[PDB]
Design a protein around this motif. Structure first.
Motif, short mmCIF file in Angstrom:
data_model
loop_
_atom_site.label_atom_id
_atom_site.label_comp_id
_atom_site.label_asym_id
_atom_site.label_seq_id
_atom_site.Cartn_x
_atom_site.Cartn_y
_atom_site.Cartn_z
N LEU A 34 0.84 -1.19 0.00
CA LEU A 34 0.00 0.00 0.00
C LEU A 34 0.88 1.24 0.00
CD1 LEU A 34 -1.37 -2.24 2.23
CD2 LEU A 34 -3.25 -0.66 1.81
N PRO A 86 0.73 5.78 -0.66
CA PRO A 86 -0.13 6.95 -0.86
C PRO A 86 -0.41 7.13 -2.35
CG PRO A 86 1.62 7.47 0.67
CD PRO A 86 1.93 6.11 0.13
N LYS A 87 -1.68 7.38 -2.66
CA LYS A 87 -2.14 7.46 -4.05
C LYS A 87 -3.09 8.65 -4.21
CE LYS A 87 -5.11 4.63 -5.92
NZ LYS A 87 -5.89 5.72 -6.55
N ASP A 88 -2.64 9.83 -3.77
CA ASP A 88 -3.50 11.00 -3.69
C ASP A 88 -4.46 11.09 -4.86
OD1 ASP A 88 -4.40 13.76 -3.08
OD2 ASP A 88 -3.10 14.30 -4.76
N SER A 95 -5.73 7.45 4.29
CA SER A 95 -6.31 6.21 3.80
C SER A 95 -5.36 5.03 3.97
CB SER A 95 -6.70 6.36 2.33
OG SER A 95 -7.05 5.09 1.79
N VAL A 96 -4.08 5.24 3.68
CA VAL A 96 -3.12 4.15 3.79
C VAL A 96 -2.93 3.74 5.24
CG1 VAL A 96 -0.77 3.42 3.27
CG2 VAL A 96 -1.99 4.90 1.68
N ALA A 156 -5.95 1.60 6.09
CA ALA A 156 -5.87 0.33 5.38
C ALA A 156 -4.83 -0.59 6.01
CB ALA A 156 -5.56 0.56 3.91
N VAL A 166 -6.24 -1.95 9.26
CA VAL A 166 -7.20 -3.01 9.00
C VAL A 166 -6.49 -4.28 8.58
CG1 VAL A 166 -9.07 -3.72 7.47
CG2 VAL A 166 -9.11 -1.47 8.52
N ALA A 188 -6.07 13.56 12.12
CA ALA A 188 -6.49 13.00 10.85
C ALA A 188 -5.92 13.84 9.72
CB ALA A 188 -8.01 12.94 10.75
N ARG A 189 -5.47 13.17 8.66
CA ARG A 189 -4.80 13.84 7.55
C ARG A 189 -5.72 14.85 6.90
NH1 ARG A 189 -1.35 11.26 4.05
NH2 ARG A 189 -0.70 9.89 5.77
N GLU A 201 -6.70 14.80 3.03
CA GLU A 201 -7.60 13.81 2.45
C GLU A 201 -9.05 13.99 2.89
OE1 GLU A 201 -6.14 9.91 3.22
OE2 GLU A 201 -4.50 10.09 1.77
N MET A 204 -12.20 11.34 3.35
CA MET A 204 -11.57 10.07 3.02
C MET A 204 -10.60 9.64 4.11
SD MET A 204 -9.90 9.03 -0.62
CE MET A 204 -11.49 9.12 -1.42
N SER A 205 -10.13 10.59 4.92
CA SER A 205 -9.34 10.34 6.12
C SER A 205 -10.22 10.19 7.35
CB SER A 205 -8.35 11.47 6.36
OG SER A 205 -9.04 12.70 6.48
N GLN A 214 -11.65 6.83 8.00
CA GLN A 214 -10.70 5.82 8.44
C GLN A 214 -10.83 5.55 9.93
OE1 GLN A 214 -9.18 4.46 5.89
NE2 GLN A 214 -10.19 6.01 4.63
N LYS A 272 -13.84 2.97 10.06
CA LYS A 272 -13.29 1.71 9.54
C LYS A 272 -12.44 0.99 10.59
CE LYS A 272 -10.33 1.94 6.11
NZ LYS A 272 -9.89 2.02 4.70
#
Ligand SMILES: CC(=O)SCCNC(=O)CCNC(=O)[C@H](O)C(C)(C)COP(=O)(O)OP(=O)(O)OC[C@H]1O[C@@H](n2cnc3c(N)ncnc32)[C@H](O)[C@@H]1OP(=O)(O)O
Ligand SMILES: [Zn+2]
Lengths: 316, 263, 316
Positions: free
Chosen positions: B55, B57-59, B114-115, B118, B121, B143-144, B147, B150-151, B154, B157
């Motif tokens: 995994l 980062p995939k901004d 997100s990473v 993930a 998890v 929290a980022r 993002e 989407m952060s 997390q 999740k």
């Protein structure tokens, strides 16, 4: 600091101490000093045996409140190993009147909850004299739930004057905390063994004392209200406490014959304070026996038996 | 090879500090420790196996506040040497299988994106399939922000994952290092079975500055510190870093009902 | 009190009010007054339609914070009947920033939890401007558990600046309350439908917003941090808030394409404040539609779907 009726015994013990010091101050008279020490030791043993032969309910109640007696931490130290103390109810604060944690009983992992009065006059005021605020019963519930999660038996030491009747403790719902503990402790899927070492009662003790096996030391009391309170409300006086203590039936054998406790743990001669190590050994043996005969039952059968035992309380 | 502790202003020898797990030998100040070094110290030797290493980062938002968020990610990845904040490693603890996770506070303030979620998890799933405790060391500024939701999600999740673990009866210890604030203290850092915290660690939800702005008064002395929180019930216990490994082993030896570790 | 960019519309509305008063002050000139009122009403409608055609993210964020907008109690009043308000977390106090209760949605019994900012300047300070202390999230958890017990679906209204960053609220473990809500709300065995009416975010909103269906009104925002805070920390200034609002992507259509919410509830022309009744009707229809397709799933399938939806968040 011995009790009033134990004034003679204390004197003898003091005498023994003096002789011991003398035996450690000279060497040419050791034989006679040692012989006198042995003779006075036998004298003290016989005097303690005869004094304790007939003790009234008030005398036993005084013994349970003796200002020299093993508390929860003492029993933990002398009968358990590898004790990690968990603090906090996660909501408001951690009550120092209740100490809980996870330790090992002869290698087995157990959860320990119990009241802690405190030894000296500093810890006594730091721990509210063993009277827990609601944030102590909530911590007890949290630890009991944690133990029940990890297939862990629970052991409770009940030594407290009662729940703290403060303004802050009343604002934070003492009644709700106690009631939730009573409701949740009847559904735990792990065997619970409770002992009433020291003084307990008023319902702030039953909050951590709804177990499969309820035990009580010989010289421990367990009452719906302290004898002072019972005398004050009913006898209209405070100096008639011993009458209330005798009438209520707060002594261990009296509660035993009512089918309210499971067994009485015999104490060392002269009360548990004289020989705390022997008291701890006896308590550890009793705990091991109770877990030994509680493990055979399945979880469903364990819970059913607990429910039936609860529903069998009272004459109705 | 001579560093200085900013809390006491000493001249600590660098390797003396390194062998003491980045703890001042004079005032016992708990200073920064990188995720990989922390996980090497905790878990046994020769058994580390990293998880969730595929995994990156995939901004997607294409964020840009003052520097391109892709540039921020590249700079942080070059500086720290880790793809994202959280590092998960399977291993053994005194002969006991265990999955550990450690934050890397140097990576954009250890912020949870997100990473991060993930990877957490993935750690929970690995613990579930191979029944074993999970240990998480938290060091995050929140929290980022690059993002957005989407952060934020997390949090939920990760919480859900932990719920699953709690349903299986697997222990989960949550070590709270310095600092642990924002959406990391409010999602999974304070959601452990035991909330262990290192000494004098700033733990909370809202940082001291915003609390000062909103209240416009003087904060109580030692606010949000570990010693102040343990009295407020949020922290189960406070464990010094050099004693952490053993302590953790013992605890998980009793929760899992395994024989005590060999010291 | 309309927003700055809505000054023209406000002026027109005031004019209309004046004309109405004149129409209610005389009788011989009613025809011309009514014709002028109709013409100016059409003018206001067209002006509102064209003004709102292109609104920036900052404009939308201002709309979500409009100091005239239906709050949780307003939606409850205008879309639910027979609402009983349950107060208290049973531990410390009842937070007025979160209002919860049990009511009926078209006869069906539902549980309602949501943030309540307050209408005027007195209620705003009484309700802490919609910012709840941990004893509000604990009440929310208690009510959600109660609803889940009695096979009852849950409905959440998310309208709050965020969790209160106070010293008192921080001492009582805000982080623990939020984390516990997030963990427990993913296991509820009843369908949960969440809407983001008004302003929500910062993680003190996700504490009551982990649901099976997440909905958002057209002109409502949902961000990890308020645009002011994001600008302050990242843009190093407070006057660059609109840049932060545009960059984060806090508007409903922007969040929809990221697969973060399920649907957008179209609002009455000119924001939900102009026609609260139409907004309530639209929200009620959306809630009924969301519950209709959630009842078909079994409880186990419902929980599995919720877990998968949670695990599908993020690009990783
Ligand atoms: C609402 C949220 O969840 S995010 C809000 C921000 N966080 C908070 O309010 C909680 C705590 N607030 C803070 O400022 C810190 O985390 C504190 C109080 C622990 C202070 O720790 P500090 O030693 O001051 O760390 P600092 O804030 O400088 O973090 C280091 C870096 O991480 C960045 N960072 C930290 N958290 C975040 C975040 N959530 N989003 C983006 N960047 C972040 C900072 O911008 C900083 O970058 P820079 O040094 O290049 O300017
Ligand atoms: Zn130092």
């Amino acid at each position: 600091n011995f009790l009033d009726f134990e004034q003679p015994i204390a004197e003898l013990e003091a005498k023994i101490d003096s002789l011991t010091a003398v035996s450690r101050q000279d060497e040419k008279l050791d034989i006679n000093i040692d012989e006198e020490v042995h003779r006075l030791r036998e004298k003290s043993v016989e005097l303690t045996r005869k004094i304790f032969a007939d003790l009234g309910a008030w005398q036993i109640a005084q013994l349970a409140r003796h200002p020299q007696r093993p508390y929860t931490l003492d029993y933990v130290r002398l009968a358990f190993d590898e004790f990690d103390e968990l603090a906090g109810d996660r909501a408001y604060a951690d009550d120092k009147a209740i100490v809980g944690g996870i330790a090992r009983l002869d290698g087995r992992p157990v959860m320990i909850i119990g009241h802690q009065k405190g030894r000296e006059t500093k810890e006594k005021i730091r721990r509210n004299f063993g009277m827990p605020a609601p944030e102590g019963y909530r911590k007890a519930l949290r630890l009991m739930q944690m133990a029940e999660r990890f297939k862990m038996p629970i052991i409770t030491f009940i030594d407290t004057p009662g729940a703290y009747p403060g303004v802050g403790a009343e604002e934070r719902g003492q009644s709700e905390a106690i009631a939730r503990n009573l409701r949740e402790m009847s559904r735990l899927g792990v065997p619970v063994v409770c002992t009433v070492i020291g003084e307990g009662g008023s319902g702030g003790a039953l909050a951590i004392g709804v177990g499969d096996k309820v035990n009580m030391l010989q010289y421990s009391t367990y009452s719906v209200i302290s004898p002072e309170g019972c005398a004050s409300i009913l006898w209209k006086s405070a100096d008639k406490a011993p009458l209330a203590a005798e009438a209520m039936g707060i002594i261990a054998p009296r509660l035993k014959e009512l089918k309210l406790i499971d067994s009485i743990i015999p104490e060392p001669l002269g009360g548990a304070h004289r020989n705390p190590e022997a008291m701890a050994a006896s308590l550890k043996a009793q705990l091991l026996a109770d877990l030994a005969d509680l493990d055979v039952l399945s979880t469903e059968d364990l819970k059913n038996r607990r429910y039936q035992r609860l529903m069998s309380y009272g004459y109705a | 090879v001579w560093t200085k502790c900013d809390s006491c202003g000493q001249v600590l020898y660098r390797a003396e500090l390194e062998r003491n797990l980045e703890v001042c030998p004079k005032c016992d100040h708990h200073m920064r420790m990188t995720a990989r070094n922390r996980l090497h110290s905790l878990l046994d030797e020769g058994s580390l196996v990293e998880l969730g290493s595929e995994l990156e980062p995939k901004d997607v938002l294409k964020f840009r506040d003052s520097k391109k968020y892709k540039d921020r990610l590249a700079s942080a990845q070059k500086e720290t040497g880790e793809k994202d904040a959280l590092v998960v490693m399977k291993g053994t603890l005194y002969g006991m299988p265990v999955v550990a996770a450690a934050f890397e506070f140097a990576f954009m303030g250890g912020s949870m994106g997100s990473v991060v979620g993930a990877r957490f998890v993935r750690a929970v799933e690995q613990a579930l399939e191979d029944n074993c405790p999970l240990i998480c060391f938290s060091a995050s500024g929140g929290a980022r922000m690059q993002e957005a939701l989407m952060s934020l999600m997390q949090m939920a999740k990760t919480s859900a994952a932990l719920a699953k673990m709690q349903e299986r009866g697997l222990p989960y210890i949550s070590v709270l290092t310095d600092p642990t604030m924002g959406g990391v203290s409010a999602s999974f850092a304070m959601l452990g079975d035991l909330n262990i915290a290192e000494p004098k660690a700033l733990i909370g939800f809202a940082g001291p500055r915003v609390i000062e702005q909103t209240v416009r008064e003087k904060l109580p002395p030692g606010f949000q510190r570990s010693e102040f929180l343990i009295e407020k019930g949020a922290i189960d216990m406070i464990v010094r870093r050099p004693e952490m490994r053993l302590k953790l082993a013992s605890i998980l030896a009793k929760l899992m009902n395994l024989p005590a570790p060999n010291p």
